[PDB]
Each structure stands twice: as structure tokens, then as C-alpha cells.
Design a protein around this nucleic acid. Structure first.
Ligand SMILES: [Mg+2]
Ligand SMILES: [Mg+2]
Ligand SMILES: [Mg+2]
Ligand SMILES: [Mg+2]
Ligand SMILES: [Mg+2]
Ligand SMILES: [Mg+2]
Ligand SMILES: [Mg+2]
Ligand SMILES: [Mg+2]
Ligand SMILES: [Mg+2]
Ligand SMILES: [Mg+2]
Ligand SMILES: [Mg+2]
Ligand SMILES: [Mg+2]
Ligand SMILES: [Mg+2]
Ligand SMILES: [Mg+2]
Ligand SMILES: [Mg+2]
Ligand SMILES: [Mg+2]
Ligand SMILES: [Mg+2]
Ligand SMILES: [Mg+2]
Ligand SMILES: [Mg+2]
Ligand SMILES: [Mg+2]
Ligand SMILES: [Mg+2]
Ligand SMILES: [Mg+2]
Ligand SMILES: [Mg+2]
Ligand SMILES: [Mg+2]
Ligand SMILES: [Mg+2]
Ligand SMILES: [Mg+2]
Ligand SMILES: [Mg+2]
Ligand SMILES: [Mg+2]
Ligand SMILES: [Mg+2]
Ligand SMILES: [Mg+2]
Ligand SMILES: [Mg+2]
Ligand SMILES: [Mg+2]
Ligand SMILES: [Mg+2]
Ligand SMILES: [Mg+2]
Ligand SMILES: [Mg+2]
Ligand SMILES: [Mg+2]
Ligand SMILES: [Mg+2]
Ligand SMILES: [Mg+2]
Ligand SMILES: [Mg+2]
Ligand SMILES: [Mg+2]
Ligand SMILES: [Mg+2]
Ligand SMILES: [Mg+2]
Ligand SMILES: [Mg+2]
Ligand SMILES: [Mg+2]
Lengths: 149, 139, 129
RNA sequence: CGGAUCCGUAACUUCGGGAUAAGGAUUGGCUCUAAGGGCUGGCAGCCGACUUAGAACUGGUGCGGACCAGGGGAAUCCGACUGUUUAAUUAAAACAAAGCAUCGCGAAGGCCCGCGGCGGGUGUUGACGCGAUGUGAUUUCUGCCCAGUGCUCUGAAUGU
RNA sequence: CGUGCCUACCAUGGUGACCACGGGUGACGGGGAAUCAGGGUUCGAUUCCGGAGAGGGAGCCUGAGAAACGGCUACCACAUCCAAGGAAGGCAGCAGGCGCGCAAAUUACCCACUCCCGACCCGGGGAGGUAGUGACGAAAAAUAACAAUACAGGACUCUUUCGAGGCCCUGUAAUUGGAAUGAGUCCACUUUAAAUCCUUUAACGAGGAUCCAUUGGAGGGCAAGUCUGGUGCCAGCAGCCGCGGUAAUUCCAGCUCCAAUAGCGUAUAUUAAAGUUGCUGCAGUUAAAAAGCUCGUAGUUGGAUCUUGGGAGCGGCCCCUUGCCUCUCGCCCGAAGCGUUUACUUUGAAAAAAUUAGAGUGUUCAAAGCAGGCCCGAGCCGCCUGGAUACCGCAGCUAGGAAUAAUGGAAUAGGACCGCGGUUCUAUUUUGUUGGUUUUCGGAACUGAGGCCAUGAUUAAGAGGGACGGCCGGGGGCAUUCGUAUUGCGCCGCUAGAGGUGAAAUUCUUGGACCGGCGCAAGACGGACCAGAGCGAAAGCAUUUGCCAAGAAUGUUUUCAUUAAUCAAGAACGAAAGUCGGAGGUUCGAAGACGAUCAGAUACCGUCGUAGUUCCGACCAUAAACGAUGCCGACCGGCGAUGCGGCGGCGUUAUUCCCAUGACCCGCCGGGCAGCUUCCGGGAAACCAAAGUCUUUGGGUUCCGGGGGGAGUAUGGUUGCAAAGCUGAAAC
RNA sequence: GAAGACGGUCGAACUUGACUAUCUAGAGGAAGUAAAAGUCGUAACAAGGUUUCCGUAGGUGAACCUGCGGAAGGAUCAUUA
RNA sequence: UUUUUUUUUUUUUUUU
């Protein structure tokens, strides 16, 4: 069951039971980490980088081939986003919906969806302030949104 | 759809304490207007003085004229029509007598055949109508 | 959403017993559920069972005898001090000949009959008969 | 009553007021105390403003000491208010007034002046304008009559 | 004495939706009482603990101890005696009186018991104890029986018995005894301070005028009258149903019965019955009840996962995980580090009696009480034994148990443990003794350098969030375009009717209506395609086209790693109508006008026509806002569909000629709107795959209803320009 | 070492004012209940003779009528090429 | 197309 929808469908992914990479792809941890640094310098989302290594380089779930999660691989040499992606995409769409209400200041549906999006933002912000990845006095009104697009 | 967690005793007590008021017996037991609105002051009996002798109608499936006494109360000061029970006893009641009165079956309601009289005469001049009825003493 | 998965297991057991089917699937797994079915098995009300070991959370498949009238969970997991069992006895067990209560003692998931001898008491998981 | 300080301020309401509402206390002289600053030196030394708060003493209860200077409340009618008027009897409830309506007119026009000319005025203007009236803030309302009396539109429609 | 207890200075704090602050109480608080499955609910004025006050309220001396009141001072309110000059008063101590009421005892006797005070064996005590009143309540308990003889109203063992009755029940206003024994009448003991009462004993004391049981009731509930006489919807009875109007099973009387019994009726508060206040343990489609929908904090609930099989020994201990350390202190223990930390249990103390449970005990029984019981012919100048135990919510203390449920640690290493360097600081022993100088050393700290750890991050919820990418949809907004039709106007031809009805009339009509033909203008509206189809949180959304952001589902070996669900307060949308500005005004049309119909129409019918219907701005927040079904999650039958993705299928068909998406056909998966069937199971039923998984009752959570009316009314508060909305009672 | 006095503090009371609570008089108005027996109609239950009902406005002796948008608790679970 | 109203209470129950 989704949150802000009656739609309770199932569109998921399912990892297999089998652990680390089967036979082919003679590609050790060092080469994988060098690939992921060269991609993160080009600055893609880790969600995107998983898809790139899945489709091009034939890399499975990277937890198996490296032993370590990809954002931990990212942070341990410090190519960090410094604003995490799961908040970043919500702020990125909230900026656009604010702008859309401004040039169409009658769109009640977009107004309601803006309220839902800001609610999701406050939920994830309380989560990140609990798990201490963010400064505790972090706020979000308008200007932080317009800056950190 | 109740609430059943271990830490919900406050919600249960507050909701039950709110929903207890809608019962009629509880609200007239512990709301002040039932006590300070009726006569008798919440007591069993009261004394009074005969003001006049009143005959009143009965209901429609059973038609008669019931015999009652209007009473100034000693205690409160409210006027009351009170029903006088038996065959005689209207002759046994005279004008301006000390009369002890009580209720009938429940104080919020009258008897079925009687429209608006809620009260029953027990004694007149400290002598019961029972004794006045089956040959006992006198007025 | 998903809370007190013992109830989710035992309502599936109850529906399968009322329908009359042979074996049930239960998608969560707890040590609570495993020791609960261990007590039920050792007292003989169910048959042999088997735990499909998913890497995430397994699935229990239980062969059914057909004796189970009713199994269930008391919801908030009440504490029970000893010399307060007899309330729950008269309130839950259908008779004084059968029926069982699953206490949670400090020395394991025990039974109503083992608990009065071991002299422990503790929290109620559920009941079955 | 009246200044000031310190308290406290209702009903009603367009929520801005009412309101210095109503009602109290204090106020002198003389001794102090505390606070409120500037300029200099590698936190310290020199130099100054007139204000506020508090304390004691004390005068024959006396203290805005003269001068200066709001009686107040409860209600009703009318007018929204400020404004203006019968100089030499009226100051208003009258007058205007914003607001609300109504009507004429697209410039060879409206409404006017002029003895006269396409002479003036509105017009160095153009319907969110000009011209002519009615009513008079807001709030809520604007009923019923085209018979009379006006006004207007129509057709050589057909009598005069 | 400690303290904002008070002064001065300084800081600006403290509490609250986990109910602060403020009102009410016909509220003194507990130990307790009533009420019986269990859980509770209602009282606790009152004999024990503690607090407060002596008419209100203020002050104070003495004294170890008081804001004392049977001590004092003044005021206020009462009130006594006054020679009018002044005095004394404080019963909510004991009796007693007035008033008040529905509501309550004798101006008694005694310090003999209990204890208390003083100088003290002796005084004093309305504290107390005894008597009198006492149907508050309780215990035990005759009220005339009892066995008889006889008559049988006749049942029974059974014999043709028309009865043997070695049994019987009962009426005997029948007799006879025991003349049983008691209540009263009184001697004498005892009892007691003095009596009284009880027990004991003497003398009286019963044959239906006895020495006399009433209270209610007799239609159903509800045991017991279709007995009799009066009474005539009158009287009256009846807690409700109901009876009574000429035959009353119900009124009034009599007779016979019924129930409890020295206690029955009544009124009222209150408990169970009431699973009609529901935590165990209620309802919410239709009876009362799911808010219009959604977000949202406080509250409440929150997936899984981290210590195991064994061994020894019979018939509880150690480990292969099972308490770590330090051996400083007196191989091991004593001792000590000694806890991440509670919730939960089992201990153990701890506490106050009386009450309740309950042990013992013949108070003649019992309610009670805590006593008593033996031998001894007085002689034993005596013995034995008890005055138990339990229960004592919650909170606090103590030690075992680690499952359940939260919390702890190491991720920018500022880890864990062992052993060094170097800096820097001091403590007491010993150099016979005092002191000084320098150490070893003991402890803290600081600093640097390493080696060492299997060196450190549970996996990815048919939980969730987000990225992704191919489509999807009357989803939303802005702009654009199109289409008839309506209405009006302009002309053109023809011609007397045209509208409009149940039938007509109001109205337009030779000043040419309606009708046809062309054209223009304005505004509203998007038919047919349109369905038990889609989408939206709902209210809602239908001409083409573009732009703008947004979303579901599906696919995913993508990412994050518990971020989750429901939510008081708070918040965004929210049809029609309505209100305030601005623009225009096709059709319809409240109000209003007429014409007809009817007894009357102000109603339905028709003609005209106002506001509104349209758009742009703001407000109002309501509806049969309906599936009359809160939300999330799981399980429990089938079948054919249909919409949208995804997958499989040398079936068919369109390109040009592979190739793909196109169009059908076949089938599968996901979730959506639905439907047929059924004994899934339910419910009062209609009916429902949820309204099921419910007396076998407990997945989480919000809002709610408690007979109908009064009534969503009054009255307060609050929002609104107004209409009104929100909250919301009682008398009766 | 008495009477008395300045000043301080405690504070009895009395007056005045405010706030709050409880009743409580009131011309008249408007409502409900009794209540069955009166006058005027006949809105509702059957297509109640105009289907009913819900909101929101306007009017009318009276119940009521109409406007606009909904529902079926409707009198339709269906209308084909 | 019509088409409205019409006192008030009188009504109790079995054995096999
Ligand atoms: Mg939600
Ligand atoms: Mg009654
Ligand atoms: Mg004034
Ligand atoms: Mg002036
Ligand atoms: Mg006036
Ligand atoms: Mg003026
Ligand atoms: Mg002038
Ligand atoms: Mg003048
Ligand atoms: Mg001109
Ligand atoms: Mg005006
Ligand atoms: Mg006019
Ligand atoms: Mg004319
Ligand atoms: Mg101070
Ligand atoms: Mg009191
Ligand atoms: Mg009980
Ligand atoms: Mg109990
Ligand atoms: Mg006491
Ligand atoms: Mg005292
Ligand atoms: Mg005393
Ligand atoms: Mg006294
Ligand atoms: Mg009687
Ligand atoms: Mg009788
Ligand atoms: Mg009977
Ligand atoms: Mg009675
Ligand atoms: Mg119920
Ligand atoms: Mg209904
Ligand atoms: Mg209902
Ligand atoms: Mg929360
Ligand atoms: Mg868990
Ligand atoms: Mg034409
Ligand atoms: Mg609208
Ligand atoms: Mg209006
Ligand atoms: Mg206006
Ligand atoms: Mg205007
Ligand atoms: Mg019209
Ligand atoms: Mg509503
Ligand atoms: Mg809900
Ligand atoms: Mg709802
Ligand atoms: Mg398909
Ligand atoms: Mg395609
Ligand atoms: Mg009708
Ligand atoms: Mg009708
Ligand atoms: Mg209606
Ligand atoms: Mg009539």
C-alpha cells in the first residue's frame, strides 16, 4: 500500500537466493570501485549508477561482488553528494511545483500535490535528523529549495 | 474498532468518562438540575399544608375524575397536586391540614391513568389514611 | 501495517482448520512462532512441519491433524503474575479436561501446565485447544 | 473634576475604537544612594550631560499649593463624520459631501452662451469622458400599479 | 534549623492537551461497608490512625509543649443582669430545652471494671461503666401443642371378605390424660458500687370467654376464586399490561384460599439483574450511530534477525557458548572490581490494629467472646495449652531468572587488548636520630611510536521512500480551433393564420406573423460515438490542437535501510444554491405578472419576465457529499468478462521485402471497477467473498450511539459582510 | 518600676467600588407539551391523484408550491441495431 | 381535466 494513494499494487524487484557472482565477469573489487569513481565524478545518482553497472558492465547487486554497499564505497573516499538523493528529488520536484503554481495561480490540484510533497519532505527530514546524517538545525522553507536545485 | 494497546488506559478512561454522560440515569444522578429542580429536595417524604381540593381528569382509554390536594410545601415552597388514594379520604382531608406525602413508582413519571399528579398522601394530622380507612383512631 | 505476526499466523491456521485443508503457508517467521508450534506439536495437536528458509524471512508449512478447534492470540500480551492464572483458565479454556495456555517465561516459551510447576509466570502469547 | 506618575478600565462595535471611559492612590522641603557616557594606553588613567528609580529625616495632612486646567454616567430622536451657510437676530435636524443609482451623446454630436459670422465654452477634451438629475457612509432591503400625467420608439399605418 | 520564609541586588524564568490554571461537590482523608461467576459499581457524618474548628475572624501571655477558647484582648453578630454609674457571656463536652425538619433516647446511678492526671497505696474524672427509652439491625426462638381413645372424609400390604388393620394422613369447637411446659403473678439466692436483667429454686399458673399472629394478595407477570351480594367509564383498583359503560375471575364487602411469619406493606438513595456503560464484554448498510475527503504534530501501535544440539550421573550440575576479572586483600575460596538500564516475573524482608477468610474452643445452639481443659472423695498450699495462619491494590528496598518488549556500543575510528618510549606531577617507608640535596619507586595525567583483533557496517520485509522507462488516462491549469442549434436582425417569395393545451385563452398577426432561401451577430453548450468503461483524495471531469507541471499501475539482480499505520489540536481542497466587485445578458427562470382549471389556487398547465444560470477575482464549508458500509494489513471457493501494463503462443491479417511495433485469436502474471453461482461462514432478515475468520468472544487505530419527543431548540463562546456554520443543555 | 507617647509590624472590623455564583419580580412577545372531543383545508402512505426525499434560496392562511444540483429509502437491477 | 372530508372507545383466553 502506497502512502498518498489508494493504489496498493506491487511493482518491486526480487533479489535471488544465491550469493556472490557465479562464474563469468572476471572483474574484481578494484576495477569495480575504479568504475564507480569514474562514474561518480561524472556525477550520476547512485540509483542511476546501479543501473549503469547492471546494463553495461554486467555487474549484479554490488553488495555481492564487492562485499560493501555502493554509497559506503562512495563515502569512504568522499565523493559525497552532501545532500542525499532521497530528499534531493523531492526538493527538485517541489521547486518546479512552486514555480508552476506561480505562473498558474489557479491550479488547485497542483496546490494539493505540493502539500503532499512537502509532507513527504518533512517526513524524510525528521528521519535524517534522527539518524544524524544532517545538521539538526536544518530547515526547508523556500530559499534552500531555490538554491539546492 | 476499539483500542487495545498496553499504554492506552488514559484514552480508554477519558472516552468512557465522556460517554458515561449520555445515559439518562447517570446524568440525572450526577447533574444538579434533577436535584434542584424537583420538589422533595431528593427526600422520601415531605410535610405540607392543604391549599385546595382538586378533581382532575383521567386519560382517554380509561375516563374518570381523580381526587387530589394542592399543597404548599413546608420545606421548599412549591405547589403540588397530590393524589388521595382510597374510596373516602377526601372527606378525611379538610382545608389547611398538615399532610405527609411521598412518590408513586418512580419520581420522574406519574401513574398511567393520571395525567400530571406525581404524589401520594400518606398521613393527615400524623394519622395514616390506612388507619382512617380500616377503622383506626380518628382525624 | 504488519504487527503481531503471531496473530497473522494463527488466523491462517484457524481459517485452514475451519475450511478443512491439509497444510498452511505462513509468510513471516519468528522464534515465537517456531516454539509455539513446537509446544503444539509436542502436545500433539498438529503434525510434522517444515521451514522454507528464505534468505529474507522464511515460510512455515504445517501438516494438520484435524483436531484443532480454535487457536488464537491475546492481543496486548498481558503480564500474568502467578495466582492470577485461574481467571484466564475460567475465561479462556473450554473445560477443565483439556485446553492450553502459552506463557512466556524467562526460561523459554512454556506451557500452562509446565508453568505452574516451574513456578515462574510471565506474559501470555496465546491459547489453543 | 482638571497637570503628571503608578494601578485599573465595562456595555457596544464597521474590531480601527470606546478611552484622559468609570474608579483609586501619590505629588512639598532637605540629605543621599544606584543606574544611564566621552577621550586617552598596550583591561587601566583623565574629562563631563541632565534624567530616571529607590531610601531616610521632616514640616500644624501640607504638597499641579499662584498661574496653567476635560464634570461624569445612563438613555432616546436626528444627522454618518471633518467641512460650509442667512456679514447686522438663527450654526441646525439645513447645505454640500464620498457611496449608490438614472439619462443624453461617437464630434455635421450632446449641453450651453452669443445682436451678429460655422463666433465662442466644455475642448490643450472623446464613454474609466463630458453634460443633466435623484438619493445620501457602511449593514440589510428596493414590494405592487402604464389608469392619469409626462417622456420615448415606431410605421405617409391611416383620420386631422 | 534547611529554604523567596522576608529584605536588597542580579538573571528572565516556572507549568500545560501525559489536562496546567480556574469553577463545582448535598468532598473531611484512609483502615473499611453494601453489593456474590470473574472484572467491577456505589458509599465511607460516625467508635481505630491522622487533620481541622470551638459563633465569624484577628492578635497574645504563661508554659517543654497552644495562636488553647470549660485561658486572655479588641471588632462584628447575638444575648443576660442593670440602682443606667457598669458587670459577666461562647453546650459542634454530659443530660435537657427552642427552632429546623421526613428524621433521632433519662436534667438518672457509680468510680466497682478500663485506664488517665497530681506531691501521691487514700483525691478526682458526665473519659468511661451500669440502669431506663430503643421494631436501626442481628442471633436463638413458643405462640397452645402432643401422643392418645372413639366417629371415619377414606388411602394403603393383600385375602370372593361387604376388613385383618401390631401402618396411616386429616376434620373432629367429641372426650381423655401427660394434666407435659411456658408467658405473666410473686418468696429466697445470686448478679452489682447499689440494685436491675439472665440462669437456679419454692407457690400459683389451659381447655376454645382460651393465655386469640398479623401483614399483604388472589386476571397475566406471580404462588392463590372463571365463590356470593352490592356497585353501573360513576366510584374506584392497578408500580406496567390493563378492569369497571347491568351478570366485574381485578372496585367495595363476606366466605374460602395463597405467601412470609413475630415482620410484613409503603416511599426514596443505591447495587445486581444491566453483555440496556460493555477492559474482559456492546453497537455503527437499513433500527441510534463511520466525520465530505485528505495531510498532519502530541497520543497509540510498530516486520524479521544476534546463545545450540550435548556431556557426567542416577532414576539437580558442567559444556563443545553457561557469570568475566584481581589474587592487591586473607592450586582454590573469602574478599573486590560490581553492572547499558529499566520494564517483566519468582523470592525475601517491610507494615496497624480492628474488619474479611480461616485454625482451635460445646457462648446450653448461634450471632459472639478468647477462652479454657485435667487429676485431686478439700490435701497438687496445683499442672497442660491457646489467644493461630492467610489477605494487605499501587509506589519504594533486596537477591535469582534473560524468553518476551524498548535502550547501549566501533563507520570521517576520537574502537577493543598487551607491551614500550618520552614529558610532567606528587604520596610514605628506609639510609641509629633531626633536617636538606638526589633517586629507585607508587599513583594520576600528558605525549609519541608501533605490533596485534577473521580488525569493525545483520540481509534487503508480497513494509516503505526515491531514481529509472515504455505506455496510460472526459486527471489539473492556460491558450487555441471547430460544430450545429437557439435567439435577434437584415433582406427575398408566398399567404391568413400562428403559437400553445385535458380542452381553450392570455401573446404575435395585411404595419405580412409562422413558413421557406441567403447572410450576419451574440452568448451558452459539446448530443449522437457513451458502456454496469477510464481517471481523480473526494466534490468532479467529454469538440480539435499546442504548452505547462503532476500521478497511478506495470517492468526492474536500481538506490536508501525502518524512514511504517491510524490520528485530538492544527491545515489544503470541497457540487448546486447564496453573498461582494468587474464584464455581458443566448436559452431557462425563484420572485412578480396575467390567461385557464377548480368551490378556493397564491398549485400543477400555458404566455411574459426579475435575480441567478457565464467568465474573472474573494467569501461561505454545507447534501440522500450514498456503497446510507472509517483506514491499513492478512487469510478464506469457483467462473466468464472488461480496462491498463508485462510475458508466452512457425494461429490469422494487413506494408514492400526481412524487420519491428500495428489489428484480432489463444493463454499466464500483477493489482482496478464490476458481475453470475454457492450451505465458506454470518446475520433479525433483506442480503454480503465481505456486512466472514465472534460466548471457541482480543491484528493496530481514529470518530462516534445509548427509548422516543422537547431539539440540533434555548443559552453561552467562536467564525462569517450576511444568509448561517461549529460546539450544545435542561424543565417537562 | 507603673500610666502615657513617636515610629514599626500584624491585622480585627466599617464604608465605597469592582468581579463572580445562586435564586428572583416583570407589561408584552415567541415556542413546546397536554389533547382525545372544535373551524379551515387535505401535504404524506398506493403514480396519495403533480413520484418521494435531501441540501440551498424566494413566496404564500394553512399544511405547502417553485427555482437549481443531487439520491433511490423508485414506480426502472434488462431495450437489442 | 376533477374526485375533497366522514364522531369515539367498543377485540379476553383451555385441559389428554
Ligand atoms: Mg494516511
Ligand atoms: Mg412509570
Ligand atoms: Mg460612552
Ligand atoms: Mg471639546
Ligand atoms: Mg428606536
Ligand atoms: Mg454633520
Ligand atoms: Mg462659501
Ligand atoms: Mg447666530
Ligand atoms: Mg460643442
Ligand atoms: Mg446607503
Ligand atoms: Mg420604488
Ligand atoms: Mg398608452
Ligand atoms: Mg524583592
Ligand atoms: Mg462540606
Ligand atoms: Mg460480591
Ligand atoms: Mg470482586
Ligand atoms: Mg478522630
Ligand atoms: Mg484547635
Ligand atoms: Mg478543651
Ligand atoms: Mg462549652
Ligand atoms: Mg390492597
Ligand atoms: Mg376480592
Ligand atoms: Mg398462579
Ligand atoms: Mg402498587
Ligand atoms: Mg446495544
Ligand atoms: Mg430511517
Ligand atoms: Mg439511522
Ligand atoms: Mg505522531
Ligand atoms: Mg520487532
Ligand atoms: Mg426565418
Ligand atoms: Mg459553484
Ligand atoms: Mg438575496
Ligand atoms: Mg456594495
Ligand atoms: Mg459598483
Ligand atoms: Mg420564459
Ligand atoms: Mg453533515
Ligand atoms: Mg474515517
Ligand atoms: Mg468518512
Ligand atoms: Mg493486453
Ligand atoms: Mg506502442
Ligand atoms: Mg395527496
Ligand atoms: Mg404528491
Ligand atoms: Mg422534501
Ligand atoms: Mg373537516
Amino acid at each position: 500500500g502506497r502512502m498518498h494513494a489508494p493504489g496498493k499494487g506491487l511493482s518491486q524487484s526480487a533479489l535471488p537466493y544465491r550469493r556472490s557472482v557465479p562464474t563469468w565477469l572476471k572483474l574484481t573489487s578494484d576495477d569495480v570501485k575504479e568504475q564507480i569513481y569514474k562514474l561518480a565524478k561524472k556525477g550520476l545518482t547512485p540509483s542511476q549508477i546501479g543501473v549503469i553497472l547492471r546494463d553495461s558492465h554486467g555487474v549484479a547487486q554490488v553488495r555481492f561482488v564487492t562485499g560493501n554497499k555502493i554509497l559506503r564505497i562512495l563515502k569512504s573516499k568522499g565523493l559525497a553528494p552532501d545532500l542525499p538523493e532521497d530528499l534531493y528529488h523531492l526538493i527538485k520536484k517541489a521547486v518546479a511545483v512552486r514555480k508552476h503554481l506561480e505562473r498558474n495561480r489557479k491550479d488547485k490540484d497542483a496546490k494539493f500535490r505540493l502539500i503532499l510533497i512537502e509532507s513527504r519532505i518533512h517526513r524524510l527530514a525528521r528521519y535524517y535528523k534522527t539518524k544524524r546524517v544532517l545538521p539538526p538545525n536544518w530547515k526547508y522553507e523556500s530559499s534552500t529549495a531555490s538554491a539546492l536545485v | 474498532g476499539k483500542c487495545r494497546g498496553l499504554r492506552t488506559a488514559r484514552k480508554l478512561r477519558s472516552h468512557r468518562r465522556d460517554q458515561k454522560w449520555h445515559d439518562k440515569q447517570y446524568k440525572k444522578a450526577h447533574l444538579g438540575t434533577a436535584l434542584k429542580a424537583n420538589p422533595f429536595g431528593g427526600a422520601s417524604h415531605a410535610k405540607g399544608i392543604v391549599l385546595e381540593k382538586v378533581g382532575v381528569e383521567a386519560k382517554q382509554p380509561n375516563s374518570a375524575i381523580r381526587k387530589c390536594v394542592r399543597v404548599q410545601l413546608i420545606k421548599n415552597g412549591k405547589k403540588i397536586t397530590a393524589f388521595v388514594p382510597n374510596d373516602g379520604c377526601l372527606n378525611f382531608i379538610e382545608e389547611n391540614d398538615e399532610v405527609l406525602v411521598a412518590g408513586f413508582g418512580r419520581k420522574g413519571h406519574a401513574v398511567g391513568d393520571i395525567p400530571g399528579v406525581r404524589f401520594k398522601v400518606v398521613k393527615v394530622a400524623n394519622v395514616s389514611l390506612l388507619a382512617l380507612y380500616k377503622g383506626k383512631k380518628e382525624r | 501495517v504488519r504487527m503481531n505476526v503471531l496473530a497473522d499466523a494463527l488466523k491462517s491456521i484457524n481459517n485452514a482448520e475451519k475450511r478443512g485443508k491439509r497444510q498452511v503457508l505462513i509468510r513471516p517467521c519468528s522464534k515465537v512462532i517456531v516454539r509455539f508450534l513446537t509446544v503444539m506439536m509436542k502436545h500433539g495437536y498438529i503434525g510434522e512441519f517444515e521451514i522454507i528458509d528464505d534468505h529474507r524471512a522464511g515460510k512455515i508449512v504445517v501438516n494438520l491433524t484435524g483436531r484443532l478447534n480454535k487457536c488464537g492470540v491475546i492481543s496486548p500480551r498481558f503480564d500474568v503474575q502467578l495466582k492470577d492464572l485461574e481467571k484466564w483458565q475460567n475465561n479462556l479454556l473450554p473445560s477443565r479436561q483439556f485446553g492450553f495456555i502459552v506463557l512466556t517465561t524467562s526460561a523459554g516459551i512454556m506451557d500452562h501446565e509446565e508453568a505452574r510447576r516451574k513456578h515462574t509466570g510471565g506474559k501470555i502469547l496465546g491459547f489453543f485447544f
